[PDB]
């Protein structure tokens, strides 16, 4: 997260940090037993991190569970990160408490403008890098879809959406991929992609969750 503010122990209770020996990604617990990222996070030998607060420090509200299997989306495209959405099942459900809790599912799609939390412990820097040991938050509102592409001129698809700031200066970045962007209470977005980090006319797109509702809560419900 570039130009973020440091969000405070435990203030975010759904994030996840996906670890493979190193923390590699964000992602979201959903209920006691699931966890969404991106697609283009990806890997084997995944540990799911809740919790956590510094990511380099046992503070005592972490749990530790190890992944049972992990399902890309149907349709990912990794060329132009179309569908960037996974599924992650955990190999016991976590002990849900204060610290440790899901985010609600959106029952619709938020409108641009409308404001959105966005976390992680990614890169902090536009130029150079710098990685924070505890989770970074960031405000950032929904940007429309004319505005986005004649600024960018990135192609982003019906399952997209980009948010921050025109102007740079405040971004997810690096390491902040497959985090949670939650709006009214509800995730309605996932760090996906974007041109650099905080650069001007180059905001952050995003997964746009409202649209694989119906495909997660049937993968849930069979696996
Ligand atoms: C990869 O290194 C980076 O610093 C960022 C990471 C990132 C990830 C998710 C969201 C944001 C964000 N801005 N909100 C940033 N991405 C890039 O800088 C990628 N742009 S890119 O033009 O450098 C690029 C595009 C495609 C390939 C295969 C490789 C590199
Ligand atoms: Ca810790």
């Known amino acids: 997260i570039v130009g973020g ?34 697609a283009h996070c990806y890997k084997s030998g995944i540990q799911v991190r809740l919790g956590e607060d510094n990511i380099n420090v046992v503070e005592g509200n972490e749990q530790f569970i190890s992944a049972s299997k992990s399902i890309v989306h149907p349709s990912y495209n990794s060329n132009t990160l179309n569908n960037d959405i996974m599924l ?20 619709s799609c938020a409108s641009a403008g409308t404001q959105c939390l966005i976390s992680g412990w990614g890169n902090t820097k536009s130029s150079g890098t710098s990685y924070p040991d505890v989770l970074k938050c960031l405000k950032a509102p929904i940007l429309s879809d ?33 985090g949670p962007v939650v709006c009214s209470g509800k995730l309605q977005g996932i760090v996906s992609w974007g041109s650099g980090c905080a650069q001007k006319n180059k905001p952050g797109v995003y997964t746009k969750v409202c649209n694989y509702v119906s495909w997660i809560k049937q993968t849930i419900a069979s696996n």
């Open 146 to 178: 004319s505005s986005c592409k004649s600024a960018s001129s990135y192609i982003i698809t019906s399952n997209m959406f980009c948010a921050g700031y025109l102007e740079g200066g405040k971004d997810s970045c690096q390491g902040d991929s497959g």
């Open 88 to 107: 992650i099942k955990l190999k016991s459900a976590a002990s849900l408490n204060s610290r440790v809790a899901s985010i609600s599912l959106p029952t």
């Open 5 to 38: 503010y440091t969000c405070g122990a435990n203030t975010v209770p759904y994030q996840v940090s996906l670890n493979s020996g190193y923390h590699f990604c964000g992602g979201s617990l959903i209920n006691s037993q699931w966890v969404v990222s991106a």
